[PDB]
């Protein structure tokens, strides 16, 4: 039965996923403007053009999905939690609700952080480094950028979860604070691996990474038993 529950909770997450995608589809052209402002106001000379033959949808869809995972996270986190505790780890259920709410706001926070802190600071190191304006004007490619923004905004939105998800793991006794202090070095690559999978150059890869690592240090810090 431990095996069937997953097949009955996963479908509840994907089905809700398609609901947040259908709704977002309409707010795609809107959410799309948002993702442009950072560049349309900071560097108006920079020109973003669809190098593609006529693929403005590919961008509208990719967005309508990721962001769709943002508005649907409230259900996703719910199904997730209700599949592990009290299910298999915790027990009390008064600690369940606060888990949902917290994890919920932590998602919006994890989502806001990147879009308002990471992404902006990223571009600054991408083309905002010195008077290197001559090598970049009708050069900007919407894809590279847009694709970057989203992937970056999501990875961070989720990454933020590790804490709470790991916090509960420790309180239950599955993982001790020390076991992590010994995984510090190994995790460093993790943050540098994910940081390389979405960031173009070192400056960016390193940038975003640090924040995750740092937050991961908060988790262990919370290790107050």
Curated annotation (Swiss-Prot):
UniProt xrefs under Pfam families: TatC (PF00902)
GO biological process, one term: protein transport by the Tat complex
Keywords from the named record: Cell inner membrane, Cell membrane, Membrane, Protein transport, Translocation, Transmembrane, Transmembrane helix, Transport
Molecular function GO labels: proton motive force dependent protein transmembrane transporter activity
GO annotation, cellular component aspect: TAT protein transport complex
Transmembrane segments: 11-31, 57-77, 99-119, 148-168, 187-207, 208-225
InterPro entries from the UniProt entry: Sec-indep_translocase_CS, TatC
PROSITE patterns: TATC (PS01218)
Membrane topology per record: Multi-pass membrane protein
Role: Part of the twin-arginine translocation (Tat) system that transports large folded proteins containing a characteristic twin-arginine motif in their signal peptide across membranes.
Subunit note: Forms a complex with TatA.
Family: Belongs to the TatC family.
Full protein name: Sec-independent protein translocase protein TatC
Gene: tatC
């Amino acid at each position: 039965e431990h095996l069937r529950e997953l097949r009955y909770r996963l479908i509840i997450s994907i089905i809700a996923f398609l609901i947040g995608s259908g709704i977002a589809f309409y707010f795609a052209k809107y959410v799309f403007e948002i993702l442009k402002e950072p560049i349309l106001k900071s560097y108006p000379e920079v020109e973003l053009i669809t190098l593609s033959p006529t693929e403005p949808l590919f961008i509208l869809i990719k967005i309508s999905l990721a962001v769709g995972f943002i508005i649907a996270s409230p259900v996703i986190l719910y199904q997730f939690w209700r599949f592990i505790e009290p299910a298999l780890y915790s027990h009390e259920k008064r600690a369940f609700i606060p888990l949902l709410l917290g994890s919920i706001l932590l998602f919006m926070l994890g989502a806001l952080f990147a879009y308002f802190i990471v992404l902006p600071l990223a571009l600054k190191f991408l083309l905002g480094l010195g008077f290197t304006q001559l090598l970049a004007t009708p050069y900007l490619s919407v894809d590279m950028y847009i694709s970057f923004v989203l992937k970056l905004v999501v990875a961070f939105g989720i990454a933020f979860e590790m804490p709470i998800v790991l916090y509960v793991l420790q309180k239950a006794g599955v993982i001790t604070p020390e076991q992590l202090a010994s995984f510090r070095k190994y995790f460093i690559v993790i943050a540098f691996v994910i940081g390389a999978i979405i960031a173009p150059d070192v400056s960016t890869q390193v940038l975003m990474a640090i924040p995750l690592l740092l937050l991961y240090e908060i988790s262990i810090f919370l290790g107050k038993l």
